[PDB]
């Protein structure tokens, strides 16, 4: 399928009109990954940093584009996003505990189309840890506590495996395009991984996607693949015929994955087990804005209140946004009787926080 990008422009830390902060352009939920994001100053183009291409569980992509510094001394900052699902470039102005382990794979049908044909990134608790592409075929760390606790023989061993998996992904892609009787620009995605619940429960998953839509889903309990297609059903019969491979996948997800997860958790016990509380700010521009800055972990709940019940009508959700420090921020708005009290409710460590915003 094809999905339009969702865009939000915000600052890392609350602006001070003198304190140089970081401008952020979060572009997420899009597919295909063909995109270019530009930060703007009164229309002019600014040199900005762009993060690695990252993947969500729903097969969509997301990028964090940020400028080195913005003091915000009486100017107009915006963002330019051009995508295949857009006719004209969209403009957005700036105005002011269960642990998991995931491994993704992104394959692009030949030729390059500008993008690396194969990309593999690993995540623990949505922290990037590993990276690999078909351009520079190298096992690379994306966390400090990853490289420091893994000897160079580990990355050399997996850089070889990845080269094998890269080639295998390329063949599977051609095999799919032939089955679907079409050629050209097509994408292929894989996501494997497990998660450790707070109580001790564990779960695991293996999924495949073609062109951003669900293709094959594996069930480790009944040792079977699920297909939602007449084409994906073909591969299902091939894969299910190999009972030993199905068994091997169950073992990896249940035993081997969990083992790796706990191993990496001990490595990053400092960053992954921490809790930083949110700083709540309230503003008005009618419309009342409630912000929450620099919290961790991402799990959070915010809602506006009226005397003092939750407001469902005329509200905006915002969603969980990356801050850039390794922390996160969100926001909730409400459009506006007599003598009514409007206050923002936030729960993190829970720990219920309330900030009184407005009254008559």
């Amino acid at each position: 399928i094809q999905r339009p990008p969702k865009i939000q422009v915000y600052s890392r830390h609350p602006p001070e009109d003198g304190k140089p902060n970081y401008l952020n352009c979060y572009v997420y939920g899009f597919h295909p990954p063909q995109i270019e994001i530009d930060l703007l100053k009164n229309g002019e183009k600014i040199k900005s940093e762009q993060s690695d291409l990252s993947f969500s569980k729903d097969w969509s992509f997301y990028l964090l584009s940020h400028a080195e510094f913005t003091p915000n001394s009486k100017d107009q900052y915006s963002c330019r996003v051009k995508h295949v699902t857009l006719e004209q470039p969209r403009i957005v102005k700036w105005d002011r505990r269960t642990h998991s382990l995931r491994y993704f794979r992104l394959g692009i049908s030949e030729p390059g189309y500008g993008i690396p044909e194969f990309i593999s990134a690993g995540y623990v608790d949505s922290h990037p840890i590993t990276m690999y592409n078909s351009v520079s075929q190298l096992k690379e760390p994306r966390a400090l506590w990853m490289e420091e606790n893994l000897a160079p023989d580990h990355w050399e061993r997996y850089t070889q495996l990845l080269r094998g998996w890269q080639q295998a992904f390329k063949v599977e892609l051609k095999q799919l395009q032939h089955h679907y009787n079409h050629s050209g620009f097509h994408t292929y995605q894989r996501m494997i991984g497990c998660e450790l619940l707070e109580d001790g429960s564990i779960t695991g998953f293996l999924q495949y996607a073609y062109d951003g839509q669900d293709f094959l889903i594996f069930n480790k309990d009944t040792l079977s693949w699920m297909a939602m297609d007449n084409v994906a059903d073909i591969i299902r019969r091939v894969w299910e015929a190999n009972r030993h491979e199905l068994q091997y996948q169950k073992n990896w997800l249940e035993e081997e994955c969990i083992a790796w997860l706990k191993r990496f958790l001990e490595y990053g016990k400092d960053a992954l087990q921490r809790t930083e509380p949110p700083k709540v700010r309230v503003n008005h521009k009618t419309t009342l804005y409630c912000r929450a800055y620099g919290f961790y972990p991402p799990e959070i709940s915010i809602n506006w209140m009226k005397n003092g019940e939750e407001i469902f009508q005329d509200t905006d959700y915002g969603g969980i946004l990356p801050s850039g420090d390794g922390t996160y921020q969100t926001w909730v708005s409400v459009e506006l009787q007599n003598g009514d009290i409007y206050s923002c409710h936030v729960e993190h460590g829970g720990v219920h926080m309330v900030l009184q915003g407005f009254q008559e």
Partner: antibody, heavy 108, light 115 residues
């Protein structure tokens, strides 16, 4: 890191033999049994990942991930069964650790 | 089909160079070279996950390797040593990093190096 199995075993034709194999590795991604006739290529016999038994004809292989234990069970021994039996385990990284095989001598 | 390996027997004087040929007819991607010795399990000298890439194994000392095709994988030893007396096996599998994927061996190559 380590994998052990008997050096030699001797059994009569028509009988039943059991070759044990014990391993202690970093991780576990499967256990293979290979048959190798003297002066010839080793060939794949059986494979185990999950706990339990795997039966293919007269040959059956058992695995216990907790114990790190596996046995190859040969029933109704024929003369052609006389060979070396190689036990092998996939490491946490997908490398393959080979134990020095068990030579089986079949008496008519 | 099968995994073809040449030669089966070779005698060498210490210091001689020699190369072993291995051809795989099964359209496989991973290829290996093993070294079988009495009292020891198979040891991997060099391997290749797919064409274009190769890497050292458990005992790479004194050996060289090259992947010509997707079909051919050659073992080269430029300066033969008496310690290199063994039975070399060329093996082939569909993929590396797979779990249940078995190995396909060649008939075997008997090597004895003498002073």
């Amino acid at each position: 890191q380590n994998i052990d199995q008997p050096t030699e075993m001797t059994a009569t034709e028509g009988a039943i033999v059991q070759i044990n194999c014990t391993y202690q590795t970093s991780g576990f991604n499967g256990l293979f049994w290979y048959q190798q006739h003297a002066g010839e290529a080793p060939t794949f016999l059986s494979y185990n990942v999950l706990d339990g038994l795997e039966e293919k004809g007269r040959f059956s292989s058992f695995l216990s991930r907790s114990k790190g234990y596996s046995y190859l069970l040969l029933k109704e021994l024929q003369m052609k069964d006389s060979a070396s039996y190689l036990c092998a385990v996939k490491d946490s990284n997908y490398q393959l650790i080979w134990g020095a095989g068990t030579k089986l001598i079949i008496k008519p | 089909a099968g995994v073809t390996q040449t030669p089966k027997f070779q005698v060498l004087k210490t210091g001689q160079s020699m190369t072993l040929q291995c051809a795989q007819d099964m359209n496989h991607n991973s290829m290996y070279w093993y070294r079988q010795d009495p009292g020891m399990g198979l040891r991997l000298i060099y391997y290749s996950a797919s064409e274009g890439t190769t890497d050292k194994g458990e005992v790479p000392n004194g050996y060289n390797v090259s992947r010509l095709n997707k079909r051919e994988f050659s073992l080269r030893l430029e300066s033969a040593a008496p310690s290199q007396t063994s039975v070399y096996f060329c093996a082939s599998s569909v993929w590396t990093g797979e779990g249940s994927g078995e190995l396909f061996f060649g008939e075997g190559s008997r090597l004895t190096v003498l002073e």
